Amino acid sequence: RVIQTAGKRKTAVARATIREGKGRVRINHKPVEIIEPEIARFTIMEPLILAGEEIVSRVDIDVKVEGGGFMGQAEAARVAIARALVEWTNDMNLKEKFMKYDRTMLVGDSRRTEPHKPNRSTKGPRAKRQKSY
């Protein structure tokens, strides 16, 4: 059987697919073990290392992620992978573990950008020019 999941992180969207296999994970056609940089690789692989060998050596996961930066892509893929694993196992020990570790694995992140306002719109909403009187 096959299962599909999704994940969102600011402006980025990931779709993951899990099925039976040997333990391979691919993100945009390439393995996760040669993902650079390390700060994104650990981000993506933290749920797998929490789930363990006896669960991950039996499945194969493929993620297609597009939009919004490499860090956002990595977070979205992490979310999708956690959700897919929890569903595929229908295990609750895993869910408790993930929740005590970081509840944004399964739950998402709702933060987006604030629109910009005049008096130096380019910089941001709250930043302004300086005066000297």
Partner 1 sequence: AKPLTERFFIPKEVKVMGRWSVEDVTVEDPSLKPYINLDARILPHSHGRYAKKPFGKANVHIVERLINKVMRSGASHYKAGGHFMRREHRSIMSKKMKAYEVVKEAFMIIERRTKQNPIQVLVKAIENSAPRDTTTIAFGGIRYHMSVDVSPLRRLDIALKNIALGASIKCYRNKTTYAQALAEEIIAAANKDPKSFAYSKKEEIERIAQSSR
Partner 2 sequence: ATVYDVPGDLLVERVAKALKEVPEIKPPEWAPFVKTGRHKERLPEQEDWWYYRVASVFRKVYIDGPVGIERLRTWYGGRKNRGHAPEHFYKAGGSIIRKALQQLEAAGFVQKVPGEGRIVTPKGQSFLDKIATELKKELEEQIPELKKY
Sites of contact with partner 2 (CB under 8 A): 22-24, 29-31, 33-34
DSSP 44-111: HHHHHHHH-HHHHTTEEEEEEEESS-HHHHHHHHHHHHHHHHHHHHT-SHHHHHHHHH-TTTTS----
What is the closest distance, in whole angstroms, from the C-beta atom of residue 1 to partner 1 in the complex? Answer: 29
Residue numbers at the binding site for RNA (CB under 7 A):
10-12, 28, 36-37, 66-73, 109, 111-132
State which residue, 3 or 6, has the beta carbon closest to RNA. 6
State which residue, 39 or 99, has the beta carbon closest to partner 1. 39
Residue numbers at the binding site for partner 1 (CB under 8 A):
33-34, 37-39, 42-43, 45-46, 49-50, 75, 104, 109
Q: Please state, in angstroms and rounded to a whole number, the distance separating the CA atoms of residues 113 and 115.
A: 6
Pairing mode, strands 59-66 and 30-31: unpaired
State which residue, 41 or 95, has the beta carbon closest to partner 2. 41
